[PDB]
């Protein structure tokens, strides 16, 4: 018998390939970790990640909750967008609340405190490697210890699309599904998929 050829299936375009690769990552974490969360901003990258998360589990809902670390106040059009988003998707959204000082106490500490209160061992961030220079040496999985800090020797080489999620009791990770996407990839994905977006068109 003669095997099937590539001329039978539509070849993988860059966005479809990125889509599949990010879906795979999300599934792995879900498969290996007990209490994941999707850290959802109200911004554009987190909107792409949430769309990927849906695609990852269809026809099921997200097996993990979605989180928003709320500051004092963001744009009014963001709250209204996110509020409608929860009701229109039957979503489980957790809000948390307790730019030098501001961001440190509200975001950094807030997110830190939110992860402890619920007992999450994995957290989905929509950060990209092309967003800041340092991010170039970043991995998909970012291992944190009990007291929450990052240690170099605890980080693991990421070989193929095989990922090591073996973690200890009280240890948590940071996952970046979108790390291979570029600014152009995201907007191009938003446009083709028709992902709803906050009326403001400048990076939030």
């Amino acid at each position: 018998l003669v095997p099937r050829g590539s001329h039978m299936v539509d070849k993988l375009t860059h966005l479809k390939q990125l889509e599949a690769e990010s879906i795979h990552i999300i599934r792995e974490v879900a498969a290996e970790f007990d209490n994941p969360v999707m850290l959802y901003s109200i911004g554009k990258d987190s909107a792409v990640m949430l769309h990927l998360a849906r695609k990852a589990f269809f026809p099921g809902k997200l097996p993990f909750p979605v989180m928003h670390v709320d500051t004092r106040w963001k744009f009014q059009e963001m709250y209204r967008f996110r509020d409608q988003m929860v009701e229109e998707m039957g979503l489980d959204l957790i809000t948390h609340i307790n730019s030098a000082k501001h961001t440190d106490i509200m975001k950094t500490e807030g997110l830190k405190q939110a992860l402890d209160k619920h007992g999450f061992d994995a957290a989905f961030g929509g950060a990209r490697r092309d967003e800041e220079k340092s991010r170039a040496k970043e991995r998909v999985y970012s291992f944190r210890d009990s007291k929450h800090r990052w240690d170099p020797k605890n980080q693991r080489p990421e070989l193929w699309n095989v990922y090591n999620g073996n973690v200890n009791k009280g240890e948590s990770i940071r996952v970046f599904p979108l790390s291979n996407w570029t600014e152009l990839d995201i907007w191009q994905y938003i446009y083709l998929e028709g992902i709803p977006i906050v009326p403001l068109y400048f990076a939030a």
């Binding site: 018998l1 299936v9 375009t13 099921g60 490697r129 080489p157 090591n164 073996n166």
Partner: protein, 394 residues
């Protein structure tokens, strides 16, 4: 806009040592892809300004999307280059025109070949310094080919480009400084090389990643097609056990598909209530790979701690997770000289042929037949660290 919607993705690795000119080359590529004014200078500066780190660089054209895997060329960063090489489609092996093929040229080539890179381009740089001497180019090409011959190093494409990263010759546009050169420029290669290298359209391998059970009547088996094409109604088998069923449906967010090819994130539904767990492979019933608990493999050791035969490790293949050990080391390959040598230990950055033993059998493929089902990582049971990259020989 408009044309940028249907592009491919090519990941390529850059290999070379200090002062070969790779910061200049990468800088030139990242820059001249934007010119549809020496800003280039500041780009090259930034790039010039003990770790497991791989640098991932991003740029595109109208034709395709590019990810550059950048890693230092020193022996100490072999694991780093290995990590980078694992996802790459192509390697740029960078040589200085005055020095030609060196030990690092040989070492980088081996690593690329070992990790299944099917396309290499020997970038013979600084040809501007020798006056675009054809004799020098032909000298370097011939003795690289002689080296390649003594590895059984037969990638699907091997190109030799005479260039000047500094001056731009044959980097983006073809050069008038080399009328004797009939080949295409870099970039022309990078845009045009066929990446149907994921040859596996012939043999279905579906590693089961996630058992989706939303309600009592939908039972789905989610994962990514490593290889082959699955079709609604195909007779499949799982390779843990050998038991068979027919594919009921291919389920995605877009709906239900008749077929799906390699690299697609799908969910498979089955006609029979067959027992399928995460870790099992779903395969065509008329085309079944070997299933065993023992196999030969190449190992790239990447832990500070040495590897000890008999010591229990965890073997994560793709979604298959099975504890086991290395029974024996057949030989250790000296990365610089490319020859076999007996060993009873593997150190950091060392590569060798090993005999692997598992507690339970997995379905397997030679890494040279399948880049997914022939690839695995070794995991330390006490430290949780990823200590070695493995690729099956069969």
């Amino acid at each position: 806009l408009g044309q940028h919607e249907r592009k491919e993705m090519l990941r390529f690795l850059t290999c070379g040592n200090v002062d070969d000119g790779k910061s200049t080359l990468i800088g030139r590529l990242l820059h001249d892809s934007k010119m549809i004014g020496d800003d280039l200078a500041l780009l090259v500066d930034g790039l010039q300004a003990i770790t497991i780190d791989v640098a991932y660089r991003y740029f595109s054209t109208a034709k395709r999307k590019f990810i550059i895997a950048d890693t230092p060329g020193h022996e100490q960063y072999t694991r780093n280059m290995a990590t980078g090489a694992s996802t790459c489609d192509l390697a740029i092996i960078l040589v200085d025109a005055r020095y030609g093929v060196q030990t690092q040229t040989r070492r980088h080539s081996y690593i690329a070949s070992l990790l299944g890179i099917k396309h290499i381009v020997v970038a013979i740089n600084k040809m501007d310094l020798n006056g675009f001497d054809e004799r020098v180019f032909e000298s370097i090409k011939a003795d690289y080919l002689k080296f390649a011959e003594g590895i059984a190093f037969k990638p699907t494409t091997m190109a030799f480009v005479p260039m000047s990263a500094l001056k731009g010759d044959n980097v983006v546009n073809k050069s008038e400084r080399s009328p004797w050169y009939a080949g295409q420029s870099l970039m022309e290669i990078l845009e045009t090389v066929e990446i149907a290298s994921d040859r596996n359209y012939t043999d279905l391998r579906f590693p089961v990643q996630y058992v989706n059970r939303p309600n009592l009547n939908f039972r789905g088996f989610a994962g990514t097609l490593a290889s082959g094409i699955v079709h609604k109604g195909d007779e499949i088998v799982v390779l843990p056990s050998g038991k068979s069923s027919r594919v009921k449906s291919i389920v995605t967010f877009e709906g239900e598909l008749e077929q799906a090819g390699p690299g697609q994130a799908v969910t498979l539904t089955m006609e029979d209530e067959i027992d399928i767990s995460r870790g099992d492979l779903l395969v065509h019933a008329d085309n079944v790979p070997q299933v065993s608990d023992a196999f030969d493999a190449m190992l790239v050791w990447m832990a500070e701690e040495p590897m000890l035969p008999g010591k229990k490790y965890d073997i994560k293949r793709a979604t298959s997770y099975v504890p086991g050990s290395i029974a024996s080391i057949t030989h250790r390959v000296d990365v610089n000289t490319l020859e076999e040598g007996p060993a009873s230990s593997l150190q950091l950055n060392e590569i060798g042929r090993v005999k692997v033993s598992l507690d339970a059998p997995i379905a397997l493929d030679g890494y040279s037949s399948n880049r997914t089902t022939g690839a695995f990582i070794v995991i330390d049971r006490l430290t949780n660290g990823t200590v070695a990259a493995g690729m099956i020989i069969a």
